[PDB]
Scaffold this active site. Structure first.
Site, short mmCIF file in Angstrom:
data_model
loop_
_atom_site.label_atom_id
_atom_site.label_comp_id
_atom_site.label_asym_id
_atom_site.label_seq_id
_atom_site.Cartn_x
_atom_site.Cartn_y
_atom_site.Cartn_z
N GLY A 196 0.81 -1.23 0.00
CA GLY A 196 0.00 0.00 0.00
C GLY A 196 0.84 1.27 0.00
N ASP A 197 2.15 1.18 0.27
CA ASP A 197 3.08 2.34 0.25
C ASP A 197 4.49 1.84 -0.07
OD1 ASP A 197 4.14 4.96 0.47
OD2 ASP A 197 3.91 5.01 2.66
N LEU A 198 4.61 1.07 -1.15
CA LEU A 198 5.86 0.37 -1.51
C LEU A 198 6.65 1.24 -2.48
CD1 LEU A 198 7.30 -2.24 -0.80
CD2 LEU A 198 6.57 -3.11 -3.04
N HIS A 202 11.06 2.20 1.77
CA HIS A 202 10.49 1.14 2.64
C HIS A 202 11.07 -0.22 2.25
CE1 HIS A 202 6.79 3.89 3.57
NE2 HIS A 202 7.85 4.19 4.32
#
Length: 297
Positions: A196-198, A202
């Site tokens: 969802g926030d790759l 990260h």
């Protein structure tokens, strides 16, 4: 921040069964968590996340569940949350550094890896494949958000109209988002479990580009797979995105002919998604940053 002393932090941690040395680094860039790099009395390195405000219990328990679930399915390390209360989250430090970091002052990109590394593309594609393979049944069992194909366009329509109303948006960005919403053939007829926030911030990798870990799992849910490709296109470019989709497909990654197109629209939509974030928080500093990306500054 100076909001808490090293002694205050040692007391909090000792209360959760973690005995810490007085050797501590801080990262104060997080809006929700004060981050501490600590040492326990056996020389084990720990990451502490200390909530900045009250009310984050639901958020912390959800991320806990997500980490327990993805741990069963990924080849790469994820944070092992050995402590998880409303007062403190703590996990032992993972093997590798993020692919990039941000300058404390300016938020300039500092590359820890050679961006052009093709080992990044082959290893990232394998991780994307394993995340997207996580079965729906298991996701439902963990009370996580599940967006169906038919939910996606209504939601983004509502995001657009809300952000236009409260923050504002340039005519050029608004018409691109409206054309995207009306371009049916871009939207996949299936959703899958996504980080969802790759993006590189990260992803943990060796200097040669071998992905060994993924952090910051708070946003993980079932949604448009293109969301997990969007963060690649900004930093690595469109040729690199093409190589990644191909490598992903070779592994048996479920694609469609317009995954490429959808990813570029998703990336071009970062300012809208930041609009949403900045709008929920109500932080004026964040709203002004949003306006700038949305082209009303």
């Amino acid at each position: 921040r100076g909001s808490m002393t090293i002694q205050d932090i040692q007391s909090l941690a000792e209360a959760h069964g973690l005995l810490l040395t007085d050797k501590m680094n801080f990262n104060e860039m997080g809006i929700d968590f004060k981050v501490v790099f600590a040492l326990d009395t056996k020389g084990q390195q720990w990451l502490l996340r200390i909530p900045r405000r009250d009310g984050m219990r639901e958020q912390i328990k959800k991320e806990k569940r997500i980490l327990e679930l993805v741990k069963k399915h990924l080849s790469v390390e994820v944070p092992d949350w050995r402590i998880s209360s409303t007062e403190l989250v703590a996990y032992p430090i993972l093997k590798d550094n993020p692919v990039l970091n941000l300058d404390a002052e300016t938020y300039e990109i500092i590359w820890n890896m050679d961006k052009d590394s093709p080992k990044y593309i082959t290893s990232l594609a394998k991780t994307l494949f394993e995340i997207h393979s996580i079965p729906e049944k298991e996701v439902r069992e963990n009370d996580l958000k599940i967006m169906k194909p038919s939910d996606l366009r209504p939601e983004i329509a509502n995001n657009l109209q809300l952000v236009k109303s409260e923050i504002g948006i340039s005519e050029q960005l608004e018409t691109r988002y409206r054309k995207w919403l009306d371009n049916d053939v871009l939207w996949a007829d299936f959703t899958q479990f996504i980080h969802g926030d790759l993006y590189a911030g990260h992803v943990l990798a060796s200097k040669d580009g071998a992905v060994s870990g993924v952090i910051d799992w708070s946003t993980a849910h079932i949604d448009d797979p293109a969301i997990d490709f969007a963060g690649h296109v900004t930093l690595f470019g469109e040729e690199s995105l093409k190589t990644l989709i191909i490598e992903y497909e070779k592994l048996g990654g479920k694609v469609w002919n317009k995954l490429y197109e959808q990813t570029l629209e998703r990336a071009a939509a970062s300012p809208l998604m930041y609009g949403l974030f900045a709008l929920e928080t109500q932080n004026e500093s964040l709203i002004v940053g949003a306006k700038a990306q949305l082209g009303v500054i």
